Amino acid sequence: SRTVITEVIATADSQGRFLNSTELQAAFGRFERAVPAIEAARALTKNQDALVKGAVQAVFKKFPYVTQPGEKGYGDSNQAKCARDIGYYLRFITYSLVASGTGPLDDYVIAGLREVNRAFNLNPLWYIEALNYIKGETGKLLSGQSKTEALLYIDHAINALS
Template sequence: MKSVVTTVVTAADAAGRFPSQNDLEAVQGNIQRATARLEAAEKLAAGLDKVTKEAGDACFSKYPYLKQAGEAGENQVKVDKCYRDIAHYLRLINYCLVVGGTGPLDEWGIAGAREVYRTLRLPTAAYVEALTFTRDRACAPRDMSPQALNELKSYLDYAINALS
């Protein structure tokens, strides 16, 4: 799993040297930003169910055709799976906020997603809408501090760009 610390250690190990001052400074920079990241992760985890519900509702209200027969949300079981997937992306974003990098999204969310959605004939536009709604709905200081929100939005944007 890629993070600042593992990247630094991998580079030091490849060169066969002890962690240098540069390495320690890189980790220190990461630690300084960590407070905002962890705040965003905590707030997102606490509100995960609510955020998922709002995002999913926004998605189905923008694309009501999804609930017609033969579409991705034609029955309740399939609708539930849509909400589950949104919760899945938000959970991965929670992980990214903890690690401080896009590793979890890359490895467990984005890798292979295009192929899976094409096979299952699912529209990625619906996921983009759900995540975009979440991004625009979140606001500071109601939900979290501005710096934390900034971190959260950067990962939401990353997921949106990957699915667009």
């Protein structure tokens, strides 16, 4: 996929030269931020069960009408799809945290997002405010460098959706 060191190797291969000072500096700048991001990934992993619920009920609070019958959100299987989607999103946020780059998130969510949302009549605002709830609760579940990492990845996913 795409990471910081992945971009290092990619640009070195494009310019066709041995790894130099700039991109080795980038590699260790990645490695220093590796362990706060790992702590962020662990903390976000521990609490996955509370977040998936909190997110789907936050979605329902934001859009009361989707729950009402004759709509799309109606249906237990649709509820399970809600939970599965949020699980995928936070899973790939954890992956991006681990890899120190938005590559896994890019590849597994953002690639082809718009037309998938278009064809299945999925409203991106649903996931934007779901990630908004997740961002709000990571505002308290983490602090410091790990919190900044999680916040940046969540906001980048939100911008991709919007």
